[PDB]
Structure formats: structure tokens, C-alpha cells
Design a protein around this ligand. Sequence first.
Ligand SMILES: *[C@@H]1O[C@H](CO)[C@@H](O[C@@H]2O[C@H](CO)[C@@H](O[C@@H]3O[C@H](CO[C@H]4O[C@H](CO)[C@@H](O)[C@H](O)[C@@H]4O)[C@@H](O)[C@H](O)[C@@H]3O)[C@H](O)[C@H]2NC(C)=O)[C@H](O)[C@H]1NC(C)=O
Lengths: 214, 362, 223
Amino acid sequence: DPVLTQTPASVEVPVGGTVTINCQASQSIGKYLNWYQQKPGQPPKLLIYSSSSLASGVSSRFKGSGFGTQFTLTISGVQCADAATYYCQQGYSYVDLENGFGGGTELEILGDPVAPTVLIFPPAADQVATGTVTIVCVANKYFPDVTVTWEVDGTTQTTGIENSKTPQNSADCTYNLSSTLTLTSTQYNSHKEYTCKVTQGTTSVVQSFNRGDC
Amino acid sequence: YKLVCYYTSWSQYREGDGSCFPDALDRFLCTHIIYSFANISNDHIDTWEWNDVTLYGMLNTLKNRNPNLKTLLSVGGWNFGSQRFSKIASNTQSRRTFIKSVPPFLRTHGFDGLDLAWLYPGRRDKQHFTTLIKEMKAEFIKEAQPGKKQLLLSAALSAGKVTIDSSYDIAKISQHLDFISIMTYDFHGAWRGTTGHHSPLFRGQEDASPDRFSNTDYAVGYMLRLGAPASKLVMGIPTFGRSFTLASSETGVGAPISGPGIPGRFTKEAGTLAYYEICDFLRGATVHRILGQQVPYATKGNQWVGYDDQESVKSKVQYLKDRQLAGAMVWALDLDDFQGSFCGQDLRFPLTNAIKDALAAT
Amino acid sequence: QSVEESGGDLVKPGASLTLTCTASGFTISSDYYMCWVRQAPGKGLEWIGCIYIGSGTDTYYASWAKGRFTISKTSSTTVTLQMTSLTAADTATYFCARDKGWSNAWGFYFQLWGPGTLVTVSSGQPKAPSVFPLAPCCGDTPSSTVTLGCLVKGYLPEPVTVTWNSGTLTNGVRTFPSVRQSSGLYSLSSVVSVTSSSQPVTCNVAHPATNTKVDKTVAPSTC
Ligand SMILES: *[C@@H]1O[C@H](CO)[C@@H](O[C@@H]2O[C@H](CO)[C@@H](O[C@@H]3O[C@H](CO[C@H]4O[C@H](CO)[C@@H](O)[C@H](O)[C@@H]4O)[C@@H](O)[C@H](O)[C@@H]3O)[C@H](O)[C@H]2NC(C)=O)[C@H](O)[C@H]1NC(C)=O
């Protein structure tokens, strides 16, 4: 059984830079190592078959190297649309295998910093009638990542918070985040001010609404 | 029939026309070409020389025009050292990592199989040799998938009765190897103090021979008796000679010698002359044919060389065809006249072509 | 050269389910392997098994498959992954891939991949999403361009397909990754930026598992 371990787990790289991923096999697998790029929500895309051969229509930015038990993918002129998870896979045989693939390495691509524009969405009128409310807060077109804190009457919420973040935009390396605070209707209708606080290192942008403002 | 031909990596460093690279080889000359030798480094099969990888390429591109050509990589050799091959074969972990390293290594460089060249196992390594042979063939079988041809496993074995008795479990080993190259040459050497042909076909004159065993006929018949199937035996025919420096005015077989012969200009090894070197030696030498051994020798001054030529080679191929052997093994392509300009006439590989032709003649 | 998986569904634990990989224009070569690779939520690729198409009789499976998984060639254009004794740990996306055959120069590689099909293993029942509109409720001035969204909450199993104005509005839409609540149900948010001329704005949510289709038009302000 050839078992591939991949390091580092994740890595940040500035746009136009160069990255090197490491893949190593518990047995010699000769020149038969494959590299895949997998963007969020998609099947993998073959980048390099055999230790170093380029698949059709893949850029020379992707250089494969290595033999035996240690391999390397080098991504050059790191494009903003290269943010993905990269897997290596042994291409030697299908016999007595547990899993031919590695753990995968994630690219965080460092594009130009942009501050987020924050929006807040009070619950629809018919959402309170179900006994549970969910307040949606959205911060758009930002980099780097942010931290979100919810406040109810200026008091920061310790529980009930739920965040979702879109992949980096292939053009500008920027995120979009939707954070939802969920409360029972009794909790919502007994407090007055609700605050969404998005903090980007030290800069903070806020958007608030009041239960009676609606 | 199989015509199994060795190429040696060191034949590239010989001066001038002695330089031999795998691309100087006739793709259609042999059925199998074996590259000698690979290393075992950190219990992985690995390169030996520096340009092995590019020379591996030269050899295996020969199969492009002759797809039926098979190539093997030979592991071991003289400079490997029995101790190190023993340490690898005796340790259960070293074997697995070694055995598991071979198939991916052979395939990346385009070899069709492995040729074991443990020269030579010890009396204490006989079982280790059998388990290594068995487990190798075992993995070659497991590793095969639709679209992957199972890799070949062969071995170069001593033709000496003494080492065969000590080191090989012929009966058991025969069942796992695809073919066996029996090294039926180098039977006589300078340490014996007498001239003697190093690759005689038969014992010949009963008085002349020192022992009854140092001849190709006995070796072949012995391995057959020990349980090697005739269909798996490949009989070694050398394209080189053993030379001696005479110690007296006598030039016959058994004449006293002072040591190995004067080194050749291209092989630069005392006691060895390539066939193309012999053609130069033959100028102004007298040639004598040993009647009962059916092989020639030549003498010029204080030099005595027993060698194989185009006739003695045919007699040997005749013997192996009558024996229904698997075929002939040539050691080595780089010691034949691969240039075709050294021995007179226009043709390259005069000895191994003589084998091919005798194998093809009915 | 196309590959597409089908049959991914919601299943009770202990049940079994059969997925199907389908081919299109395969260069009429048999010497290749068809394989199944699974990917659990937020975790790596996991090889499952392969079947040699030239014989349809040689099968290779991962060690952990342990005979629950059976791959069969059923047509010139179909192979089936048959899964038995499913558990929560089998909740994953199931991909189909193909070889170009064995090559001493090139080896085994998956050039063709399918979009995947989702197998959700849960004792829960098929549940349709509860779509709610989103808008700014304050008295802020009605800007010429304002972001509006509709919230899809509480559905099982994945996925849902959200479009705006029946596919005619696509520029400026952000649909966020769904999140799994502690309740095991899923929920996602989708927003769009329109001008006042793009009024009225309507979002279409489809849920194949329950054959749910809901249309919702969002007013530029709350009420
Ligand atoms: C074929 O494979 C062989 C096995 O790996 C190679 O042999 C190795 O060759 C290198 C050449 O540099 C040797 O390295 C030297 O080692 C000596 C002695 O140290 C060794 O022994 C001690 C224990 O006594 C051990 O702790 C060391 O790690 C070494 O193993 C040093 O004095 C030198 O400075 C140098 O480092 C290896 O010793 C040798 N290993 C073996 C097991 O023979 C060989 O080079 C390969 N290539 C060929 C033959 O062409």
C-alpha cells in the first residue's frame, strides 16, 4: 500500500508569487504521481500526470517534479484564480490499495486588501411566527478574512452564531461572508438593539437595526 | 529460441572505437538485452553509474522499431559484494522494500523485467536466494493488472559445480524464474598456473583437463540433473577470451604460465581480450583448435588466448539446440566486434550474429 | 468525453443504494478503468474502487470497502456503484472518473471526472426548504441600487438550486455555501444587487428531493 502524506496543510501566497507543495509516499512509486486541483464544489481537475507531464490545456505555471517517495508541485506566477485545494495521487496500481490520494493542500491567495461593505437584514414578518428567528448579516467584497461578533443590546452573543464564506473571487481574490444569528422568538422580542460587528484586524464596520424600527 | 545478450554500462569509458553505448546495438540482433548493472541503495533498486538513466533510454528506444524486443535490468554484479546483497536478502524488511521498489523502478525506465546477478550467494545465503527469487516472482504476479504485462524475472548463475552446490537450490528456484542464464565461461584462470581454454564445449582430452567439471557440457547437464527445465536454461557463450603470459617456450594446452595475459588496448584488463581485440592479436599469431573441446586458441610470442570464434560458437549453438535448451546467452555485446571494422569484413557483431544465425538455421 | 453520476439520494442508515456512472463519446477504446472516488463534507478525496472496462470482470476495491461496495459494468455506456450497509460516515459526494489505460510512460491518471452526486445518510425525512425574503427594514433612503436577498432555511437533503428571475438575472448574485445546523438540516443565504429598473425581483428555489419549487418576489423594503 502506497500512502501519500502532503505538507504543508495550508499556505498563504501573494498574487504572482511562487508556491511549492510537498507530497511523499510510504513506498517508492517511481515516476507515477498525479496532481489535481479541486476548487470548492467541483470535481478535481488533473494538472500533472506522471511525475511532471502537463495535462491538456493546463498552464506551464504548474511544474511537476520528484521521483520515488518525494514529489513537488510548483505553482509559478500565482494567479488570483488559483485558490483551491491541491491533491496528489499515486498512479501506479489499483492492487492492495487503501486510498491513492493525499490529504490535500489548500492555497490561500493574498490579493489586494479591500475593506468590507456590511449589510444587515432584519427577519421577515412571517419568520417570527414560526417561533425561531434568524438575522442575516452580509459583508461583501473583502480581503483578508474578518471576525464577526453579534451584540444584543450591546452585549456580545456567546452562542447561536453561524457563518458561511464564499470562495475567493477568481478575479480579485476577495471574499463574501454571510453570518446568521439565530434566537427564539421569546429572545428576539424581549431585546431592542441588534448589532453585527465585522472586524478586519483593527478596522470595524457596523450595521444595526431595532425591532421596532421595522 | 531466446538469444539473451548482456550490455555492460562500463563499456562506455573505453577509448576511441572501444566506446559502446546502447544506441550502437542492433535492435533485431537479440530477443532480450539485459543492462548490467543496477545498484541497491538504501534497500531500493537504484542507479549505479551517473548516466544510467539516459543510457536506459538509449537501450529501450530500441524497442520502438522492434516491439518484440525485451529488455531486463540486472541487479548486482562483481563490485556489488555478496555481503551487501546478503544483508539485503536475509533481512525480511530489506527484501520487501527492495522487492516493492523494483516494479515501479523498472517501469519508469521501460524495462520488461529484472535479472538477478548475485555473484555469488554464499552457502549461508542459499535459502535467502530462494526466498528472494520466490517473493520477487510473487510480487511481479500480484502487481500485474490488465494493461500491465507481468514483469520477467531471470538470474545469472555460476556454471561452477562447487558454487552451484553451495549457493543454489536449482530445483526450487527453477520453478519461479522465467529463464536462467548459466555462465558457462571463465572455467580456467591464471591462478591455475597453466594455459587452459576458459569456455570449452566438452571436457575433451581426459589428461589435459584439471577437473572433470570446468566445461560447458558438464555445467549444462548438471543443472538439468538438478531440476532446471531445459526450456528455461539459456547457455552462456562468451565473446571474450582469457589470456595468459607463457612461462616457457611451450604454447600447448596445460603449458606453464607466468600470469594473466598482457592487457588489451581497449578493455585494459589483464587476462581479458574483447573479440575485436583478438582480431588484432590474430595478426601474425598461429591459431590452434583444441580437438576435444571444439574451441580455438591463439598464440603470439609469450601470449596465449583461448577464445570463441564463429565456428566454436556454432558448435555451441548446435549443442544447445540438440539439448533443447531455451537458447543462448551472450556475454557481452560490447565485447563482440560491435563496430564491425576491427575484425575485417563489413559486418557488426560477428559472434552474436553467428549465434542468431545458427539458432535460426534448421 | 463526458462522465455524469446519478442516483445520489437520502437514505436511512443500514439501507443500501445503487449509483450509476454514464459515459458519452469515449473514443471506442476498451482498455481503461472506471473508478469511484468519494469526498465527505470538508474532507479529502477517498478512493473507492475501479473496474477494468475491457474485461468487465476485473475489479479492484479499497481496503476499507470491505465488500460493502460492488462495481459492475452494466452497459457499453454505464457502470454502477452498489453500496450496502450505509452509515452516517458514508455521507459524501460520490465522483466517477476514468483512466486512459495503463501506460509505462504515463501510468494511471483520472483525466475525466464527473460533477458528483450526493449521498446523504440520515434517519431524517425529506424536508422542503422554508424560503423567507430579506430586505432593509429601517427608514433609510431608497438607493437606486440596493441589495436584496431571500433566505432558504431548513431543508434536507442537499442540494437546492437557486436562480433569480427564472434565470434572466445572473449578474451580481452571490449564493453562499450552505451550512449544516446542529438539527441536521441545511440552510443557505442568497443575495442579489439590482437597480430600481430591475423591479420586481424574483428568486426561484428548486428542491429535487421533495420536488419542491417555490417562487418568491422581494419588495425593496420591509413592512
Ligand atoms: C550503491 O549502494 C550502496 C549502498 O547504499 C552505496 O554504498 C554507500 O556508499 C557511500 C559512498 O559515499 C558510503 O558512504 C561513506 O561511508 C563511509 C563509512 O560510513 C558507513 O558506515 C557507518 C557504520 O560503520 C554508517 O554509520 C554510515 O552511515 C555509513 O553507512 C564514510 O566514512 C564516508 O564518509 C561516506 O559517508 C556508504 O557507507 C555506502 N554504504 C554501504 C552500505 O555500503 C553505493 O555508493 C551505491 N553506489 C554505487 C556502489 O555505485
